[PDB]
């Protein structure tokens, strides 16, 4: 089932190459992307890009929430004003809109922000595969391996 | 029988 | 909240009938009236018994005037007691038949 | 402490204020004033209150016997007031002036000379036995006269002694009062006393007039009938049935059951509008509530009494339970009572009954010797109710409480067949179907009614238009609409704690506990039958319908479902082959589909995806249609006899039943794919299906084995409910809360049982004709969602169809002729695989409705599409009327041939009745029959039976009271002559009962006699499982199944111990749970080489293999060669001798245990 769904489920990409998706059809219970990839239908309009083109979330209608406790980020969402600018990505968007709303803020080192994003994380959650940042240094193009 | 009238 | 066995039975059966709540309340009041009727009936039956005790004493005495007076009292009292008894019986029949009809419909 | 009587006893205070003199001096009841008795209670002469049902029950309850004061009619007893005398041997009474006037007076003729008694007109021994007053010349012996106010004292024969003249029936018109022995006939306001005995309307009112139906048309005439005028002609071949009026609105209302409408007009006849025109199929009668401006209507297609505003708004039903055949109606808003007659209830009894104007507190007003009560009117000033009987041929009267029963006419020579009745001043007016005339008679007593108007048609509905006929009174609902949310309906003046009105609400709503506010209905029992589609409450107490009963004229309803969001119900009229939808309130009827419908047996609705499924018994297929765009497709094609179907929107399944011999219950995805049997063992006729939404369990019911079963949606965990007492052919079922509601064909009823076990059978409805599917309407049930109805993306992103699929998914679908493209979500047209089609073949005419009808039906004069298109714009030079019709010759109208020369002008141009010849000739009524004046022939014995069998009154013409009949006829005493065929036929026909009295009901051939001698019944009804005799004697002693055994013709399943017919053994289908019925001992059947052998084990011609027909009844003859042309025609008990491991069965009466090695005794009884 995992064939042609923008996910390298086989590691080598054999299940995600376009050469097989030229003849594969999505399951009757699956949503089909504009490009042709196949996605489980619960991913249709669930605030995540899954089709690559984000065509699984094109044309959807989302409820605009109350000004009391909502921050609406680019894909459309509703999370508390308290939740933004903190250590947890609540507006999971394309581009870190949950904490990117605080560009010049300060988190001290050893509790360091993710480089150019005010999400505050310790010195070593890097080169490990956990999505510890939606920007900059999640796997750190300069330093890693605890560096002593 | 069982037919409907 | 009832005191006579017959009205308790009738209420217990009428609980399971197809009565509207309005008809249930009216039936409750009707059972209270029927209870008053049966209490009147048993009271006057006991009065009939006490008059019978007086009549037994008088008849043992044998005084013709005492016998005549106790007869005037007793036969009329028995007439009235029977009058109440037949009314109680009819009311019981009516209520029981209505409850039984309202249990099946 | 207690109250002390003069006797010297401290009498209990409760004995004061109790109507009973509880001590010798009566002081306990000397002062205390008592409370009044309400409308539902009867006032005794001492003011005591008793229940209304105690009146005329046969028992003295007021200790004055006032509640039994003459409940029986014709109680002459030779007493019949002074100044009167009776003819011995009959009891008939005649006044003194008429006796020895020279002509016989009583039917005996004892009032004149006769030699049997030796009596001659003359003054006898009264010359010696003189009284204080005049003696008289009675032939039997001198009696003597009495002055007013005095009877002749029976002890004296000489002294007249006081009584009251004011109580004599007919002494004064209206109220009377006696002044020291002198009776004064006071007249109520608005009346002027005349002649000292009669009261006439004051000229303050605009004279008076009589409005009546002569048959077709509505006429009006003066009281001294000389100036009749047509108030309204019946359009479109209608007939005016029942009429009433509103004086202060200048309005006259009437009903029309041929056109199925209710109309209104002014007395000038100008402003005409139709009041009601939906669900009024048979408006038998009508009544106007002038105080509250509401119209009370009687309907008889679905027996009910409806109350509606004038101009036809705010419909609400008052009385439905036990209504039988309701005909007459009348009301007195000044007091709050509603009277209506019934010539036979669902319980059988015909009766005249009374209720509050809101329908509460019903009471049998008259029940003895009632017969066929046909009309009711009220004497408002005298507080008496008048009603007529068309079977025992009388007109009688009782008070509002039913005390003073008096008869005003009696016998077939006077009132052979009264239908309507109206009252005014000194006279009473009534139609008669046998005399074909509107009759006029004295309100008290009379012997020869005068003809007021003579008609050639049967007349209906007399009423008298006057102001004094509708007295003024205050309206409790007149302020704030009584404070009710929607509707305010009057009641008795003492009802509702003295307010005198009760709040109700229109259809689709029910009252809040606030009892003035009302909210929407949440749930009710939807059921379908041949007559109508109805909705009743689940509670058995408030039986009145909660939705407008759906009805059609040729209709036959089977399938039902509902859409609670729009408050609509879907149904299929199997007589029309059309599927409709209609709102709860009765409006909004629309056609869902009418094309390619052969016989729709069941309906189900997916409320989340908005899809409608139905099973077709004629197409042997199930179709799904989306209401949003009217697209449809057949999703299962080759069933055998699909009957029921249910869809589970959240689980994504559907379940349908096929009852062909290898009966099975199948499950499929809501798409219609993945079709598979899930129950195919121990099934015969699985008529109904249901789903228990709380527990997610499928329920079905058998009509062959008569059992209710339920299981999980996979068919596992199968269980069987206990025996239901009289259930023997259950068709449909539904599950609501913890109960199961089932319709039974043989019972003709709806029964309710617990869903946990066998339950306690409760008969919700009974005697309900050709009953069909039952469904539980439920607004709460239809709340939910799936991937087909998410708010963010509509319809599951599918193009036309989206179907729920198990495991919380969706599958797209396409209409006919269209395929799912690469996307699997968008539909593209594919005429190659599924070519587009036309409405129907070349041989027939497609309507403008989607339905198709034969070309012969076009322009035949009758609408055959039910959306009139075969008669629309016919008759043009080039569009001929069908040769079965007749064209109105100036052009543009094609009437049916049956309407030509039928004494009624249908054509716009009257050509249908123009130039009609004469057709009598030698009509040759045979010598075995009577010939009517209209040249019809009827059996000779129907003459003088008080019935217009000739349809012109001829067979009852010249029917004087002759005292003889035809020699073949039986004579009812003083009533009529009757055919001997009706004598001892089963029910009563003569008033005295002689025709059905004393006779013995010795049964005919093929009939069974009940143990009590109640009646005879067919032998087919003996030993059936249903109680037919009243003593249950038809099912007593019937053969039973021996304990744990099966009948000698029933094979026993070794897995569970149930029984199947012996022919089901060795048939190739495992009917038992473990297949005990297909053991190795069953030989195979080998097919002669001229036939193919089906997968189901049957023989079919070699030529019919893959020929395009389901000849094998499982498509095996097709699917064995789908290669098709691509061109055109142009050992506990027993042991056996198996080859391998032993398969030892057990003996009968035992259950083979799951090990397959041991068995257990199956009987309840102990070893
Ligand atoms: C009456 O109703 C019953 C169901 O109550 C039907 O029986 C079922 O028929 C179905 C055919 O569509 C099957 O799903 C099912 O039979 C098999 O299920 C097997 C599952 O495997 C396990 O269980 C079997 C039980 O026999 C066991 O033997 C095995 O070792 C496993 O533990 C499948 O393997 C099996 O496949 C076989 O048949 C298919 C074709 O159907 C072939 O393609 C395969 O090669 C293989 O030979 C099969 O699916 C049935 N279940 C039962 C209860 O038997 C009847 O068909 C209905 N009959 C009628 C007259 O309506
Ligand atoms: C119930 O209660 C109502 C009042 O609430 C009574 O209605 C009254 O009825 C009487 C007749 O019985 C009416 O009197 C007549 O009125 C005529 C004029 O009516 C017009 O104007 C009134 C308003 O004033 C309108 O309502 C009505 O529609 C008309 O437009 C007069 O012309 C009449 O007089 C003529 O005839 C009389 C003889 O009948 C002669 O003596 C006169 O010389 C003249 O020729 C007459 O006066 C009265 O108007 C009505 N009241 C109202 C306010 O309308 C019901 O009668 C009553 N019903 C019962 C049974 O109790
Ligand atoms: C029943 O009565 C109403 C009139 O009260 C009819 O309603 C009309 O229906 C037609 C369509 O059939 C509309 O074009 C009219 O505008 C409607 N008029 C009103 C006042 O709403 C209705 O058709 C009648 N139905 C029958 C069966 O006679
Ligand atoms: C033959 O009969 C038909 C049915 O009356 C007539 O059909 C007409 O067709 C036109 C469209 O071409 C419609 O607009 C009209 O409503 C139809 N009816 C009539 C009476 O005109 C047809 O006209 C008839 N033949 C002729 C030549 O009149
Ligand atoms: C239209 C059509 O048949 N499409 C097919 C479908 O049926 C199925 O085989 C699918 C598997 O991924 O791929 C493709
Ligand atoms: C005169 C009269 O009827 N008076 C009242 C009546 O209005 C009503 O209250 C009735 C209830 O039983 O009891 C009494
Ligand atoms: C007499 C005759 O045949 N008249 C015909 C009739 O038969 C039918 O064809 C009709 C249209 O349906 O028009 C015309
Ligand atoms: C004695 C007898 O039969 N008399 C006559 C009979 O002949 C016939 O006239 C009948 C009415 O049809 O009434 C009577
Ligand atoms: C019962 C049974 O087996 N019947 C027989 C079969 O055995 C075989 O002879 C067949 C030949 O056409 O005809 C048949
Ligand atoms: C919050 O939401 C509600 C709807 O649930 C809305 O009616 C209300 O206006 C909102 N509050 C404010 C502050 O607008
Ligand atoms: C969404 O995602 C990609 C990064 O993964 C980014 O390059 C692209 O511009 C984004 N689109 C928007 C408008 O955020
Ligand atoms: C007639 O006779 C009976 C019996 O004697 C008596 O009770 C009754 O009062 C008498 N009638 C009159 C009016 O005296
Ligand atoms: C019924 O009874 C009568 C005698 O009472 C007899 O003459 C008649 O033939 C019987 N009829 C039938 C049909 O059994
Ligand atoms: C024509 O018939 C086909 C079946 O042969 C389908 O029912 C189709 O929907 C029909 N269409 C019309 C317009 O009648
Ligand atoms: C009408 O007259 C015709 C002859 O023109 C026949 O005689 C027919 O029998 C007559 N019928 C009547 C009732 O007069
Ligand atoms: C009809 O039958 C009666 C009775 O037999 C007469 O024979 C009459 O002459 C018949 N007339 C016709 C036309 O058949
Ligand atoms: C019913 O009939 C069977 C024989 O068919 C037996 O007599 C059995 O005992 C009967 N059952 C009852 C309860 O009488
Ligand atoms: Ca993949
Ligand atoms: Ca997504
Ligand atoms: Ca955050
Ligand atoms: Ca990381
Ligand atoms: Ca007292
Ligand atoms: Ca009584
Ligand atoms: Ca005479
Ligand atoms: Ca009659
Ligand atoms: Ca059966
Ligand atoms: Ca036609
Ligand atoms: Ca005609
Ligand atoms: Ca007749
Ligand atoms: Ca009879
Ligand atoms: Ca029976
Ligand atoms: Ca079998
Ligand atoms: Ca075939």
Q: What DSSP letter does each residue of D782-836 carry, written as one string?
A: T----TTS-SSSGGGG-SSEEEEETTTEEEEE--TTEEE-TTSSSEEE-TTTS--
d(CA D781, CA D778): 5
Residue A73 forms part of a structural domain: no
In sequence order, what are the residues at sequence separation of 6 or more whose Cβ sits closer than 8 angstroms to the Cβ of residue D561?
A: D569, D570, D603, D604, D605, D612, D775
Q: Which of the listed residues D777, D809, D830 is the one where a domain comes to its end?
A: D777
Do D444 and D311 lie in a common domain?
Answer: yes
Residue closest via CA to ligand 4's atom 4 equals D879
Ligand nearest to the Cα of D662, by number = 1
Three-class DSSP category at D845: strand
D587/D726 same-domain check: yes
- Which candidate, D71, D46, D723, D146, places its Cα nearest to that of D367? D71
3-state secondary structure of D365: strand
Q: Torsion angle of alpha carbons D1072, D1074, D1076, D1077, nearest 10°? A: 40
Ion ligand 18, residue ranges at CB < 5 A: A 2, 5, 7, 9, 15-16
Q: What distance in Å separates the CA atoms of residue D449 and residue D443, rounded to the nearest whole number?
A: 11
Paired residues of D437 in beta bridges = D432, D454
Residue indicated by tokens 């009284």: D131
Give the C-alpha distances (Å, rounded to integers) separating D587 from D479, D547, D554, D556, D590: 29, 11, 20, 20, 9
Does a structural domain hold residue A21?
yes
- CA torsion sign for D1143, D1146, D1152, D1153 is negative
Structure tokens at D518: 């009302």
Shortest alpha-carbon distance between residue C19 and chain D (Å): 6
Structure tokens, D232: 């309204």
- Whether the CB-CB separation of D342 and D324 falls below 8 Å is answered with yes
The answer on D494 and D452 residing in a single domain is no
Domain identity same for D366 and D223: yes
Residues 6+ away with beta carbon under 8 Å from C63: none
- CA atoms of D695 and D701, how far apart (whole Å): 18
SS3 C11: helix
Q: Would you state the CATH architecture of domain C5-104?
A: Up-down Bundle (1.20)
Of A52, A41, A117, nearest to A86 by C-alpha is A117
- In a 3-state reduction of DSSP, which class is residue D263? strand
Alpha-carbon gap, residue D137 to D130, rounded angstroms: 12
Say whether both D242 and D361 belong to one domain: yes
- CA pair distance A54, A34, nearest whole angstrom: 9
Distances D362 to D357, D504, D581 between C-alpha atoms, Å: 10, 18, 35
D673 and D714 belong to one structural domain: yes
Rounded Cα gap, residues D847 and D853, in angstroms: 7
Q: Is residue D382 part of a domain?
A: yes
Q: Residue D940 carries which DSSP code?
A: G
Cβ neighbours of residue D701 closer than 8 Å, sequence gap 6 or more: D686, D687, D688, D707, D708, D709, D730, D733, D742
Instruction: Confirm if D520 and D509 have CB atoms less than 8 A apart.
Output: yes
Burial zone of D473 (CB within 10 Å; 0-12 exposed, 13-18 middle, 19+ buried) = middle
Own/partner contacts of C84-89, CB < 8 Å, gap of 24 or more, are: C84/C37, C84/C40, C84/C41, C84/C44, C85/C41, C85/C45, C87/C37, C87/D61, C88/C34, C88/C37, C88/C38, C88/C41
- Give the DSSP letter string of D1095-1127: TTS-EEEGGGTTSSS-TTSSSHHHHT------S
Hey, whose CA ends up nearest to atom 1 of ligand 14?
Answer: D837
Minimum CA distance residue for ligand 14 atom 5: D837
Q: Is A36 among the domain residues? A: yes
Pairing of strands D557-563, D1059-1061: unpaired
Q: With an 8 Å Cβ cutoff, are D770 and B2 in contact?
A: no
State if residue D858 touches ligand 7 by the CB under 6 angstroms criterion: yes
Nearest atom in ligand 17 to D1039's CA: 2
> Helix (H, G, I), strand (E, B), or coil: what is residue D74?
coil
Whether A30 has its CB under 8 Å from any CB of chain D: the answer is yes
| CATH, residue A34 | 4.10.400.10
Sign (positive/negative) of CA torsion D89, D91, D92, D93? positive
Domain ranges of chain C: 5-104
DSSP 8-state code for residue D153? P
Note whether D847 and D859 are within 8 A (CB).
no
Does residue A94 belong to any structural domain of this protein?
no
Q: Which residue of D has its CA nearest to A32?
A: D823
Instruction: Please indicate, yes or no, whether residues D575 and D684 belong to a single structural domain of this protein.
Output: yes
Q: Which of D760, D777, D794 is the last residue of a domain?
A: D777
- Beta partners for residue D1061, in sequence order: D1050
Extract the runs of DSSP E, i.e. beta strands, from D277-383.
Answer: 283-289, 294-299, 304-309, 316-319, 326-332, 337-342, 351-356, 363-366, 373-379
Nearest to D334 by CA among D375, D288, D380: D380
Which of D1079, D1081, D1100 lies closest to D1089, judged by CA?
D1100
| The three-state (H, E, C) secondary structure of D474-528, written as one string | CCHHHCHHHHCCCEEEECCCCCCCCCCEEEECCCCEEECCCCCCEEECCEEEEEE
Do D415 and D268 share a structural domain? yes
* Ligand 2, atom 43, residue with closest C-alpha: D204
**Residue A113 neighbours by CB distance under 10 Å:** 22
Among the listed residues D598, D689, D574, the one whose alpha carbon sits nearest the alpha carbon of residue D643: D689
- Residue D225 bridge partners (DSSP): none
Q: What is the DSSP letter of D882?
A: P
How many angstroms is the resolution?
Answer: 3.4
D770 touches chain B (CB under 8 A): yes
Distance CA D83, CA D769 (A): 57
Q: Give residue ranges of C with CB < 8 Å to any D CB.
A: 18-20, 36, 40, 43, 83, 87, 90, 94, 105
| Residue from D841, D847, D850 nearest D859 by CA | D847
CB D527 within 8 A of CB D775: yes
Residue A16 belongs to a domain:
yes
Number of Cβ atoms within 10 Å of the Cβ of D236 = 9
Task: Please report all neighbours of B, defined by 3+ CB atom pairs within 8 A.
Answer: D
Q: Quick count: other Cβ atoms within 10 Å of Cβ D270?
A: 7
**D190, D205, D206: residue to mutate for ligand 2 pocket, most atoms within 8 A of CB:** D205
Q: Which domain, by its residues, includes D276?
A: 209-473
Tokens for D879, please give them.
């569009």
Only one residue has tokens 């899954």, namely A50
Question: Which of C19, C40, C83 lies at the smallest CB-CB distance from D541?
Answer: C19
Query: Which DSSP string corresponds to D26-71?
Result: -GGGSS---PPP-TTEEE-TTS-EEEGGGTTSSS--SSS-GGGTT-
D929 reaches A (C-beta below 8 A): no
Q: Is D208 on the interface with A (CB under 8 A)?
A: no
748-787 of D, contacting A, C-beta below 8 A: 787
DSSP C105: -
* Residue D617 C-alpha, separation from nearest chain B C-alpha, in angstroms: 10
CA-wise closest residue to D557 among D574, D579, D540: D574
The phi-psi region of residue D55 (left if phi > 0; otherwise alpha if psi is between -120 and 50; otherwise beta) is beta
SS (H, E, C) D957-1003: CCCCCCCCCCCCCEEECCCEEECHHHCCCCCCCCCCCHHHCCCCCCC
Residue C58 belongs to what H/E stretch?
A: helix C21-61
Residue A42 domain flag: yes
Residue A81 located in a structural domain: no
Cβ neighbours of D696 (radius 10 Å): 12
**A147: left (phi > 0), else alpha (psi -120 to 50), else beta?**
left
Counting the structural domains of chain D, the total is 3
CATH number of the domain bearing residue D466: 2.120.10.30
Nearest CA to ligand 9 atom 9: D1086
Same domain, D505 and D595: no
Residue D169 C-beta-side C-alpha neighbours within 13 Å: 21
Tokens at D1162, concatenated: 């199956």
Burial of D647 (0-12, 13-18, 19+ CB in 10 A): buried
| D759, D537 Cβ separation under 8 angstroms | no
Place of tokens 């759906």: D550
CA distance to partner chain A, nearest, from residue D822 (Å): 7
């Amino acid at each position: 089932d995992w064939k042609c769904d923008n996910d390298n489920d086989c590691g080598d990409g054999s299940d995600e190459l376009p050469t097989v998706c030229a003849f594969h059809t999505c399951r009757s219970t699956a949503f089909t992307c504009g490009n042709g990839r196949c996605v489980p239908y619960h991913y249709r309009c669930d605030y995540y890009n899954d089709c690559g083109d984000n065509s699984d979330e094109a044309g959807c209608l989302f409820r605009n929430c109350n000004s009391t406790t909502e921050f609406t980020c680019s894909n459309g969402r509703c999370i508390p004003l308290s939740y933004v600018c903190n250590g947890i990505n609540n507006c999971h968007d394309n581009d870190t809109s949950d904490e990117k709303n605080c560009p010049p803020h300060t988190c001290p080192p050893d509790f360091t922000k993710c480089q150019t994003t005010n999400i505050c994380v310790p010195r070593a959650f890097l080169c490990d595969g956990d999505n510890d940042c939606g920007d900059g240094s999640d796997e750190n193009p300069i330093y890693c391996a605890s560096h002593t | 029988x069982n037919x409907x009238x | 909240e009832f005191e006579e066995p017959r009205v308790i039975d009738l209420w217990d059966l009428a609980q399971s009938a197809n009565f509207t709540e309005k008809e249930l309340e009216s039936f409750r009041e009707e059972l209270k009236h029927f209870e008053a009727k049966i209490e009147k009936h048993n009271h006057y039956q006991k009065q009939l018994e006490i008059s019978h005790q007086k009549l037994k004493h008088v008849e043992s005495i044998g005084d013709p005037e005492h016998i005549s007076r106790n007869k005037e009292k007793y036969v009329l009292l028995e007439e009235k007691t029977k009058e109440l008894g037949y009314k109680v019986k009819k009311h019981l029949q009516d209520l029981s038949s209505r409850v039984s009809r309202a249990r099946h419909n």
